[model samples]
Target: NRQFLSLTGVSKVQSFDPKEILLETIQGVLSIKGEKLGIKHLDLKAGQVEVEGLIDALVYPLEHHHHHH
Candidate 1:
């Protein structure tokens, strides 16, 4: 009975934000939002941002291949 009630209480709390504490906790995890083109991944410790996995197909310049001989 206690376990069921505790779970119900916990589920209710999840919908509301305890803003001050929640924001502080998430600050480090989501430290940066990428604004630059081609950056697929961001790493803070190495100070490196990788574009290896970025959506290159969408951004790659369209090429027309036509041959006339």
Candidate 2:
């Protein structure tokens, strides 16, 4: 687990950096921190993503859902 990343159900990439990447997915927000991180492929219509780097950690924020009546 030191080379590539494949993620599905991603809505969009919120932000990115050499050491960090933020993504908004259908489930919630996903944060990936690594070294020399870079996006290799992305297809929003297909809801897929691929990244290449030295992955260090993956984090997901607490999700809150709102219902309108």
Candidate 3:
């Protein structure tokens, strides 16, 4: 027997307000309406950051794949 299956994931846009930073750590891509915004603060070492403004929406690529011989 053979079957085709795929998985798709979508995340909701979340608004974040930050202070005293220049880049923020976001779990997913952030977009406003149809434009991409810049992050405020990012700390790689601490894995922390500050994001400002409100996130209008979040868009992620639809991941799909199938296995076949």
TM-score against truth, every candidate:
0.20, 0.81, 0.30
Model 3 scores a C-alpha lDDT of 0.31
**Number of the predicted model whose lDDT against the real structure is largest:** 2
Write candidate 2's Cα lDDT for 1-69 as tens digits: 568989899888877888888888866777888899998889999989998899898877623331111
lDDT of 3 by residue, 1-69 (tens): 211212222132234232111111243333232222444454455554433443444333211221011
* Model 1, residue 42: C-alpha shift (Å): 0.6
Clashes of 2: 0
> Residue 17 error for model 3, in Å?
17
Q: 1 or 2, which is superior by lDDT?
A: 2
Clashing residue pairs for model 1: none
TM-score of 3: 0.30
Off-target runs (Cα >4 Å) in candidate 1 are 1-36, 52-69
Superposed model 2: Cα runs more than 4 Å off = 62-69
- Residue 60 of model 2 has an lDDT of 78
